Ligand binder design. Structure first.
Ligand SMILES: C[C@]12CCC(=O)C[C@H]1CC[C@@H]1[C@@H]2CC[C@]2(C)C(=O)CC[C@@H]12
Lengths: 216, 219
C-alpha cells in the first residue's frame, strides 16, 4: 500500500539555515474528489507526533509562518526558512488519499558541526566477570562526527562476527557529537585461548582506520 | 485542554492479553474517529485501524486480524485496543488519535502506551568495573567505565560519584543480549588525578531494589 519515501534520514543543519525536508509517494495522492491528503508531522524526543501541515500547503494552528509545503502527484517538500532550536525532531509524512493511511520513515533534523574523530578506548574482561565464567571485552568509541563508523573486532587474524552488541547515543546536546560502544562477549574459556583483541574502528577521518588493542 | 489520555506502560509475557485505554476529554467524541497507530522500534509507524464512533464498527488494517480488538464506551468517552494473546514481535508503543472527517488527518495524538513482552524474570545487574589495562595514550584524559550486565526489566540508572562526575559521562542505550538487558557508561576524567581521586559508578535497579557502587581502580 502506497509506500511513502523520505530522504535524507539525517539532515545536518546549522540553526539559521533554510532546510528542506522532502518526501515521495508510490502512487498519486490526488484523490477522485480532487484533493491531495499529504500531511506532515513533527515528533520531538520520546513524544507524540504533531500535525504540522494538512493537505500539502496548509499550516496547522500554532505552526509558524516559517514553514511551507508543496509538490504534486507524487512529489512533495517541507521547507523551514530560518531553522531554530525548537524544530529539531523527526519529520514524517503520511498520506490519507488511499486506504490504509501510510507514514514515511522520517528524516531527523540534526545539528551540523565539525568532523570529530573517535576517542577509542579498549578494556579487557575483569577479574569479577572472569570468575563467573563469561568475559566481555569493551571498546568505547567516543565523541565523533558524523554518525557512521564501522566496528571491526579482530581477535588475532580471525575476526569475530558472531558475538557483538554495539549501541549508540543520540546527538550529544552539549557539543554535538555521537558516542558508541562496541562490546564483544565470550565465554571466559574461548577468551583465554587467543592473545590479541583489536577494536578496528573505520570512521571517514583517520585513513589509518583507528586501531586499539591489548594482547592478553 | 482537549486531550486523548492513555493508560500506563504494560509488561506481559507471551500469551496473556492487554487492554489500552484512550479517553478523550473536551470534544464531542462522536464527531471524530479514533485511530490506533503502532510505532515499533526501528519499524515504521503502522496505522492499525480506525473505529467509527457513531455506528461503532471497526475497520481493521488487514495485517491485524484475529488477536486485535477495538471497542469503546461512549458515556465513558473511552476507546480500547485489546491485543489478545501477545507474542514478542508486538512490543511497540501504541498511540490513539482523533481523525478529522473533513481534512482526514490525525490532529490530536494520545501520549502513547508501551507494551513490553518478554518471558523474562526480574534479574539483578552484574556491574563490572572497566579500567585501562595499563593503557596510556589517551591525551591527559582517562576513560573508566561500568558494564551493567544481564538485568531485567528496564531501567537501571548509572551515575558516577553520586551525580558529580556529570559531563565526561556517556551512558549507552540498553541492548538485550539473550533474554536480558546489557548497558555501559563511561567517564572521561582529566588524568591529573586519577587514580589519586576516587571514581565510582553507582547503578540503581528499582525493579529489584539493588543499588551497587563499584570503585574503578587502576587494578
Ligand atoms: C481516509 C479513510 C481511510 C480508511 C476508510 O475506510 C475511510 C477513509 C475515509 C475516512 C477517514 C479514513 C481514515 C481515518 C479517518 C481519518 C478518521 O479516523 C476520521 C475520518 C477517517
Amino acid at each position: 500500500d502506497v509506500v511513502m519515501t523520505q530522504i535524507p534520514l539525517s539532515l545536518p543543519v546549522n540553526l539559521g539555515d533554510q532546510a528542506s525536508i522532502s518526501c515521495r509517494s508510490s502512487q498519486s495522492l490526488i484523490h477522485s474528489n480532487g484533493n491531495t491528503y499529504l500531511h506532515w508531522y513533527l515528533q520531538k524526543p520520546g513524544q507524540s507526533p504533531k500535525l504540522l501541515m494538512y493537505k500539502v500547503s496548509n499550516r496547522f494552528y500554532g505552526v509558524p509562518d516559517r514553514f511551507s509545503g508543496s509538490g504534486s502527484g507524487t512529489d512533495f517538500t517541507l521547507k523551514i526558512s530560518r531553522v531554530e532550536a525548537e524544530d529539531l525532531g523527526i519529520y514524517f509524512c503520511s498520506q490519507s488519499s488511499h486506504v490504509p493511511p501510510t507514514f514515511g520513515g522520517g528524516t531527523k533534523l540534526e545539528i551540523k558541526r565539525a568532523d570529530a574523530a573517535p576517542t577509542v578506548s579498549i578494556f579487557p574482561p575483569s577479574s569479577e566477570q572472569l570468575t563467573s565464567g563469561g568475559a566481555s571485552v569493551v571498546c568505547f568509541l567516543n565523541n565523533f562526527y558524523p554518525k557512521d563508523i564501522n566496528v571491526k573486532w579482530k581477535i588475532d587474524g580471525s575476526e569475530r562476527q558472531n558475538g557483538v552488541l554495539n549501541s549508540w547515543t543520540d546527538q550529544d546536546s552539549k557539543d554535538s557529537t555521537y558516542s558508541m560502544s562496541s562490546t564483544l562477549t565470550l565465554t571466559k574459556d574461548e577468551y583465554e585461548r587467543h592473545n590479541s583483541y583489536t577494536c578496528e574502528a573505520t570512521h571517514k577521518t583517520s585513513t589509518s582506520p583507528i586501531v586499539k588493542s591489548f594482547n592478553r | 485542554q482537549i486531550q486523548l489520555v492513555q493508560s500506563g506502560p504494560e509488561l506481559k509475557k507471551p500469551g496473556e492479553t492487554v487492554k489500552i485505554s484512550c479517553k478523550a476529554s473536551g470534544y464531542a467524541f462522536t464527531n471524530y474517529g479514533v485511530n490506533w497507530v503502532k510505532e515499533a522500534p526501528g519499524k515504521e509507524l503502522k496505522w492499525m485501524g480506525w473505529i467509527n464512533i457513531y455506528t461503532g464498527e471497526p475497520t481493521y488494517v488487514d495485517d491485524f486480524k484475529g488477536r486485535f480488538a477495538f471497542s469503546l464506551e461512549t458515556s465513558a468517552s473511552t476507546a480500547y485496543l485489546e491485543i489478545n494473546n501477545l507474542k514478542n514481535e508486538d512490543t511497540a508503543t501504541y498511540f490513539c488519535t482523533r481523525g478529522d472527517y473533513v481534512n482526514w488527518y490525525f490532529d490530536v495524538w494520545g501520549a502513547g502506551t508501551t507494551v513490553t513482552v518478554s518471558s523474562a524474570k526480574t534479574t539483578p545487574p552484574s556491574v563490572y568495573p572497566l579500567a585501562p589495562g595499563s593503557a596510556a595514550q589517551t591525551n591527559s584524559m582517562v576513560t573508566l567505565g561500568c558494564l551493567v550486565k544481564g538485568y531485567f526489566p528496564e531501567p537501571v540508572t548509572v551515575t558516577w560519584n553520586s551525580g558529580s562526575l556529570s559531563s565526561g559521562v556517556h551512558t549507552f542505550p540498553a541492548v538485550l543480549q539473550s533474554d536480558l538487558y546489557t548497558l555501559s557508561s563511561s567517564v572521561t576524567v582529566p588524568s591529573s588525578p586519577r587514580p589519586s581521586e576516587t571514581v565510582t559508578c553507582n547503578v540503581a535497579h528499582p525493579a529489584s531494589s539493588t543499588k551497587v557502587d563499584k570503585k574503578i581502580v587502576p587494578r
